[model samples]
Target: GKELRQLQEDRKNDKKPPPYKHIKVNRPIGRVQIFTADLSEIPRCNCKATDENPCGIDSECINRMLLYECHPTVCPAGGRCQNQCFSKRQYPEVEIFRTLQRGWGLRTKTDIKKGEFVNEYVGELIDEEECRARIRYAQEHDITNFYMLTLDKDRIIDAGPKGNYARFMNHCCQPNCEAQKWSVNGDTRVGLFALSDIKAGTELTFNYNLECLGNGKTVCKCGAPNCSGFLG
Candidate 1:
């Protein structure tokens, strides 16, 4: 949760965007059936609660290796099980603030260690049909600041209207945060994780490409030493 006056940490004089609706979970646009409605189809991890080291990082846990989160009830570790990032909201407290050029940016309220989950990125879910239509519509109206993320083959998470504080994050060539996709329950979701030990009050960022580098399409002002001057 955000504290009072935290969202105005780095205000640009007396400028701010209009408030928009906030949503904790991703809502579907239209009557799109994003995925199957069967919960049993979702994968479960067979991790045992041995000495509290359940679900080893990136390896021993089959669910983690497959990018899927284990169901709390189905997992053998029960409450001791790990890898359920979304279920537990496994992240540190963060706040929103204005940035030098990227408009608004997300910042950590406290020190965050390397590899810690920052927060979940969510909003309205639109299908490929609506996704392309919205892109074209934004272009026609000159809405440059688009808040859409391609989550799966046909689903796009549009945080423009219904979103959380994580929507305030901008892009960076070499960022202190990384965007990752993990399957929670039977749905796929995105999360921002700490790439390094970030001190309090530092603005967080991630490559918009999500997984790879860019092709010099958009100008980048991330200012990182390894910046490629592009967005992927």
Candidate 2:
């Protein structure tokens, strides 16, 4: 407690926006859902990042932009492909442990490189109606803690009951990890990627798009150097 207070005092000198002022709800504001089946076979592209056909300028760039414009199945396959969405083949090493203030947290077991794939936010995919039902049930039971990742306006992944290690990752104002939405086999999938090079024992975190609920404010206990005081 003493350490936390001293750190909070030190943070007063740092200029930052007021806490809870910038609220971002975890939901798709304006986006349409596109239904598609799982990819049985992926099409291959022959474009390489050569001198003439460099990425961003090339029409057939085998990068994430290509994958985003064309489906993941239409993009090139294999390690040679520079597509960010398609390149994530395996999950990085990580473990779950009890956090100081946060209930649980995830930590890297091996050193993670910048922009490397850490893990997928695995959970049960439900429709909007069912998602609201589950949220209502949790609220009625006085359960404040929940994990719900919005895939689109029609679908949401609720990791409250059934989830992977990524669900245990806490929120940080200044995070070293980021969650990216990737189109895989026509389905929108969320992948946690490292924003910077992370040490072996570093805790994995991302900025949760939280919003202030009524008159209640969520206090942040992330213990980051620039903690926003509130989680939102």
Candidate 3:
């Protein structure tokens, strides 16, 4: 029998955020504007402030917690900054988008190849204090983990800070998409791509597993025999 307290405990345990790393607050890429509704905005890097010491020049510079780094003096658009001194790295050919739904698909306006880069996950990093506060709010309100994509580490990209675009990609029992991870210059990043011919209306879904743990143990209703209960 499920005790009411036990159910509450399960949810509380699930919402707990893992530990995180802390560092000095660097300069921001853009100014922090507070909205009356408390709508969080994406963070801008402060890499252009200093002249002597520059940050890395690459997308996914985990050391600086940047999603996409750009050229030293100029970033075209969608590029993230590392610190106030130097430019982060760049990958001009990658196509990234923010999802308007709970999950995202891989279809594009143009014909895409079998193996093409689809979208890159981007957002701001929340401190441990903020993370814990969010979890508490979630449990108190009986909300789903409106905040998805929890890594084992504490330093997380706050996708739901403003609102997540990735959630737009819907789920499927027989998904035509797959999530794959890549390291840009040794920094970790995750991406979604087409596993088959994806039509325009087909909702994209991906197996969010580093390694599959079978037996439907993760609370998944994907309806696939291999669905591992939850997004492991």
Candidate 4:
């Protein structure tokens, strides 16, 4: 990981960011299951994914219907399908940096356009029982920071042990990024996207909207104009 302050200073003096090396966890199939196993069961796009139009939002691109990313083998376009962020791990260049106020933060090394897929949030998939146990264990161990998210009725993502750069992102009322849930392959996946056009060096953030693991409220230091001053 790199320091955010030094990156900002380098931005003005034309210094490149550090290399991006992250983890990849392939969620085993048959765990969460899917809509169907049939190939035609899901819509397939014949649209040619070119440099200009890699599954554009203009027409009835199957993936664009509900943002269900295309399968590399079944989608015809294979690796060319830009929607395969989770399946292909084709995430845009991003950097994990240490923040002064916030412990760690995420930043885009490349400029991102509005609605562009930036990063994917992945970790060990657990259930409500495991979630509570982990939270309790952390509280007993004198640990303050914990990473987890409600994936579905029974699924919870514990990113504390293992995850990607998305876990490092901080909270901001006026965040430049937003979380988007999609049906990747068969399992449900969460990804971060640009809420607006973001520059190369701008820090990426999203609203945590968390309640401090049911312990109590937390103070917000995002410093946005519409800052709630509290995150819960």
Top-scoring candidate (TM-score) = 1
Where is model 2 more than 4 Å wrong at Cα? 1-34, 37-46, 49-62, 65-79, 82-89, 211-217
Query: What are the per-residue Cα lDDT tens digits for candidate 1 across 1-232?
Result: 3542553564646466658798888898896555543667766676788735686553377877777877777777778876777777756878876665567778888998787778888888888888778777877896667788878777788888788877888889878888888877676789888889999989888888733212225577787888877665
Computed on alpha carbons, the lDDT of every model, listed in order, comes to: 0.75, 0.61, 0.41, 0.68
Candidate 1 segments exceeding 4 Å error? 1-11, 36-46, 56-59, 210-217
State every prediction's TM-score relative to the real structure.
0.82, 0.67, 0.45, 0.76
**Candidate 3 to truth, TM:** 0.45
| Whole-structure CA lDDT of model 2 | 0.61
Model 3 C-alpha lDDT per residue in residues 128-203, reported as the tens digit of each score: 5556677678668965534344332444444444422343443454666565544333234445556766544444
Give the clash count for model 1: 1
Best lDDT among the predictions, by candidate number: 1
Q: What's the alpha carbon RMSD for model 4?
A: 6.6
TM-score, predicted candidate 2 vs. hidden true structure: 0.67
Candidates by lDDT, descending order: 1, 4, 2, 3
